[PDB]
Design a protein that fits this description.
The structure is cut from a larger assembly and holds two copies of chain A.
Chain A lengths: L1 H46 L3
Subcellular location (chain B): Cytoplasm; Nucleus
Protein name (chain B): Major vault protein
Organism (chain B): Rattus norvegicus (Rat)
């Protein structure tokens, strides 16, 4: 029982930390997409402003 | 007939003692199947941990 218990806990922490680390860096990805697509829209309509 | 009864009695008793050896054998056959599966599962713990 405890054998396949640690089996199951690791086996699910597997498909867990997978999507988890993917989430980490897809998130910091959108973080800099934010900082950037900011300066995109921020000055598109700064020239179009004028 | 009175001698065949003696032969049948002694052969029946020996058959019972043969069944004694067979059944005691099967008995700890079960337990040792059991104890070796014990050790196998003890380390199947490490199997599935690391797997």
């Amino acid at each position: 029982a405890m054998s396949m218990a640690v089996e199951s806990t690791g086996n699910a922490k597997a498909e867990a930390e997978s999507r988890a680390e993917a989430a980490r860096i897809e998130g910091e990805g959108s973080v800099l997409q934010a900082k950037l697509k900011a300066q995109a829209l921020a000055i598109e309509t700064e020239a179009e402003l004028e | 007939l009175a001698i065949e009864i003696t032969t049948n009695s002694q052969e029946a008793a020996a058959k019972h003692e043969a069944q004694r050896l067979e059944q005691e054998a099967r008995g700890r056959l079960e337990r040792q199947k059991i104890l070796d599966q014990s050790e196998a599962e003890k380390a199947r713990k490490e199997l599935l941990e690391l797997e």
